[PDB]
Amino acid sequence: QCQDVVQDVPNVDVQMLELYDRMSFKDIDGGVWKQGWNIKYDPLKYNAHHKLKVFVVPHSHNDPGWIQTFEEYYQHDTKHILSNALRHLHDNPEMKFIWAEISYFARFYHDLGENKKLQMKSIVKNGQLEFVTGGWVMPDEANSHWRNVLLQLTEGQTWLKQFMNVTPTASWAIDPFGHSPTMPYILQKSGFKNMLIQRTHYSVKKELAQQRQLEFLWRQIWDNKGDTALFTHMMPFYSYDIPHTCGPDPKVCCQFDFKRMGSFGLSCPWKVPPRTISDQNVAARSDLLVDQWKKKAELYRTNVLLIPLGDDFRFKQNTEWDVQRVNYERLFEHINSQAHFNVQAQFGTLQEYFDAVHQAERAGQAEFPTLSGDFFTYADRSDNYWSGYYTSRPYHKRMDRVLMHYVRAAEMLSAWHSWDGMARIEERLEQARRELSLFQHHDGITGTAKTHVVVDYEQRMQEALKACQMVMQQSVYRLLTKPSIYSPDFSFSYFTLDDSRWPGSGVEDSRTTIILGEDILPSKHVVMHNTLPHWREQLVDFYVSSPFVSVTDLANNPVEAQVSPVWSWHHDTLTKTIHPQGSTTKYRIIFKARVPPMGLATYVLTISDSKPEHTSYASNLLLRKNPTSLPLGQYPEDVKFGDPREISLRVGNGPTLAFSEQGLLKSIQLTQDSPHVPVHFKFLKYGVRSHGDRSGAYLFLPNGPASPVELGQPVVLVTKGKLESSVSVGLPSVVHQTIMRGGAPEIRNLVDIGSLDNTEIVMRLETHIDSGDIFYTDLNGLQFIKRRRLDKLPLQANYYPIPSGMFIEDANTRLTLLTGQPLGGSSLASGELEIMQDRRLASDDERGLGQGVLDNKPVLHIYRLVLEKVNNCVRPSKLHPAGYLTSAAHKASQSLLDPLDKFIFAENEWIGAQGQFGGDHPSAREDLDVSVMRRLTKSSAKTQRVGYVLHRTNLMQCGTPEEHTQKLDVCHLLPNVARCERTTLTFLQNLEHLDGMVAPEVCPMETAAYVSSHSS
C-alpha cells in the first residue's frame, strides 16, 4: 500500500513555503550577532545534575577544485593536511578530526606505504578520524541531478567500505549554496541517520533560531506519514569558520582560532587577536568562551552542543595542529575542573554529537519539530542572493547532463556481460564515474571556479565521454554479433557515437558524415540504444553524403525517412548579418527508430541513384530582405525566398504553431478545432549595477528588470517536412530554433554571448495563463516544488534553480518548459516563465573567486515546451507544497535527458550483425525507470552481482486510460539468478532477502535498490 503523494497535505511544524509567506525578511542590525539578536541565557540552567556537554569537532574544508585544480590543491595543501592528520592523531589519542571529501582521501591513501595505510586504518577504527557523508565530493544541491548526487555518494562510500571498512551515517554539508530535500531523500535511503547543513538564508536562521527549530526532522514535501524523515541540524551563524562557530560574537570567537596570532599570515578582522592560553589567563579566557557556548546553546533544545573547529584547508602545518590542540586542551582542563561552569567539553566527532543528542531525546529531554521544504534561494547578507550560479558556465552545466546519460548508458550496456580484464571495462567506467562525480562538487557544476579550473573539469569530462563511448561501442558490438563469430579487439572502434545535440551545431563540427557512394560503399549499419525500460520510438538523424538515401530495418522492411539540408549559421562580418549556409555535399536523413526496453535496434542506410520511394525531401524557405541564392548540390528541392512574414506550421496531427515575422513562437493550437493559445518567446537582457554590489559567478544583482534584446530584422529559416519541421532565426547572441515532430516542440538555442560584457541573456515565455504568483520548479530532477513569487523580496530572490523543468498553470491550462541543462529561472509576472541562457560578468562578487565570468563559449541549450489542458487533471489541493508532471511532460523530459544513443558502424562490413537486442525485455509502466544498472563484480567472481536502482515518479491522472503494461522484475533480467536482495541505494547494505528472487516495483515517488546474484 503506497502512500498517496497528491491528496493528503502533510502536517508539519515548519513548511518552508508557508514560512516564507509569513516571514518579513527585514535585514536589521542585531548587534554582535549581526543577523540575529543579543542572546540571553539563565546561568542557573546548567548545574551539577545537568551539565552542558560540548563537542569541539576539528575539520578542514577541502574543495576538489576552486581557485586551484584538484591536483594543485592536493600537492600544495591536502596531501600535507592528511599526512599531518595521520601523525598528530596517532600521537594524540584524544584529538579528533572529521573528513568529508573522499576524492582527496582516495588520492592520498593510494600513495601511502603499507605501514601508513595500517596506521590510517587504526585511527579510523578507533574513532579518532571520522568520515562524514563519505561522498566523492560535497555536492552542489541546486544544479545537480539526483542520479549524480547518488553516483558520487556511491563512489565515495564504495571506496570507504572497501578500504576503510566504514560507512558514514552522518552527513556534513557546510558549503553548498543553499540546500535541497533531495539530499535527505537519498541519504535516508542510503542508511543515514543524521545530517548537517549550513548555508541557509540569514532570515531563515534567525526565524528558526528564535523558535529553537534549527534541529528538525526533515521529510519530503509530499510525505504524509513521515517515513522519509531525516534528523537535520542547521548551523545558526553566517559561516562555518571559527569566528562564526563558537558563539554569536565573532570578535570573541576569532580569539579562539589559534592560527590567527600572526606567524601563519592570518589575523582577526575584529582587531582582537587570539592569545596563547596560560595559567594567568585561562580562567578569564574560559569565562569568555563558555559564555559564547552557552549563548549558542540557547538556540537548541538539548544539553549537547556542537562546536565545529575549522576552515578552508586547515590543519596543514604541524605547528597549526599543535597551536589549536594545546590551547584547546588547556581550556578543557580548566573548564571541566571548575564546577561553576557546569560544562564538560572535549574534542569530538560529528557522530558523537548526534549520538549524544539522540540520547538526550530518548531521555525525554527534547522533542524535535518536523519540517518540509527546501532552502533556496540562499542569501548570506543583505540582498546578495546566490542565484547567479544557477546559470554560470552553462556550457559545463549542459556537459554534465550529457555525461550523466553517457555514464548510465555505458554502465547499462556493459552490465549485460562479464568482461575479461583485458577489455578494461571496469577501468574506463571507474574513470568516467569519478570524473562525473568530481564535477558535482559545489564549485564544479556551479560554475564558480577559476578559468583554469573550469578547463580542468572540462578536460576530465571529455576523457570521461571518450571512456563511455569506448565501453558502449564494445558492448554494442558484443550484444549484436552472432556469438560464434564475435572476435573482439578491445582497443578497436567498431562504432562511433553520433550525437546531434552535443556539443551541437555551431559549438563544434564533430559530427561524422556517413560516406556512401556507388564507387565506395553502398550502405551503412547504424544502431540505436534505448536506456529506458519501455519500448520507445524517437526520430533520429544522421549526416550522409548523398540525398538519395533510403532506410530499412533488419528485416529489410522500408522505413519512412526525410532528408533535409545541413544548415549552419554564420556571423557574416562583411554583411553584418547572421544567416544560414547550406552544404552542397552533406545532407541530414531523419527517420523514426523503434527500440526495445533497455535494448538495441539496427537499421541500414543505402544510397541509390535517384529519389528513393520511401524518402521525402523537406522544403526550405529563407525569409529576409535582400536574399542571395542558396545552392544545395544534388538536393532535389530548390530553396524558396520571401520577405519576413508570420508563418504557421503543423507536423502530423500534432499542434499548429504560429510564429512572428522575427521567427519567434507566438501561439500554439493543440487540435484542429481548438483555440490559438498565445505563447510568446522573447529574449531580454539583464545588466549589472553601476553603484553598490556587482553580479559575479555567484550573485545575481540585476540593475532592474530585463530589457528586450534589439533584434533588428533577423534572418528566418523555415524547413518543412513530413516528419520534422523547424523555424530557426539568427538573433543577436542566439540562434533560436523551434523544432516540430508531431508532439510538443523542441527548442534549441545556440547561445554565444560573445564580447557582451556585464550582460545576462534571458529567454522569456509570455502567456495568458492566470498563474498569479505561483510557479513550479524542479529539485534535482526528482520532484517539483511549488514556488511563490514574493514582492517583498528582490527580483534575484525570486530566481530558483531549474535543474530539469518548470511550469505555470491555472484552472484550465499549464505550460511546462523541460530543460536539458540546469539553469536559473523564475516567473516574474502572472503567465510568464523565464530562464537564463548565459551571463558574462566583468566583476568579482567578493566571495573568494577573484575573477569575473569572461570565459563564455557557445553552448547549445535544449528544451521541450508542453502546453496542456489540465482542467480534468487530479491535482493537489491549494495548500499542497508539491506539483507533478503529466505523462507528456515527463516523456518530454526523458527525451532531453536520456535520448536514444546512435552508433555508426565504423568499417565496411559487419559480419554476424543482428537486428535487435532486448526484444524480450519487459516494457514497464511509463512512470518507472531503471535509473542505474551496474554490474558490481569483476569476471573472476564465482557469484556475479548486478545492482539496479528503480525510481517511480508520480504523474498526474488526467483521464487517459493508458493501461496494459508488463511487470518489471529487475532480478530476472539476467539468467541464472540465485538471490535477489533489496539494498541501500549505494548497494552497500542488504536490507531484505526477497521471496522467489523477485524484486517488487516501487511506489510513486519512491526509489529502491536491488542486487541480483547469479551463479557464473
Ligand SMILES: *[C@@H]1O[C@@H](CO)[C@@H](O)[C@H](O)[C@H]1NC(C)=O
Ligand atoms: C569491519 O568492521 C567491523 C564490522 O562493522 C568488524 O566486525 C569487521 O571485522 C571489520 N572488518 C575488518 C576489521 O577487517
Ligand SMILES: [Zn+2]
Ligand atoms: Zn567549498
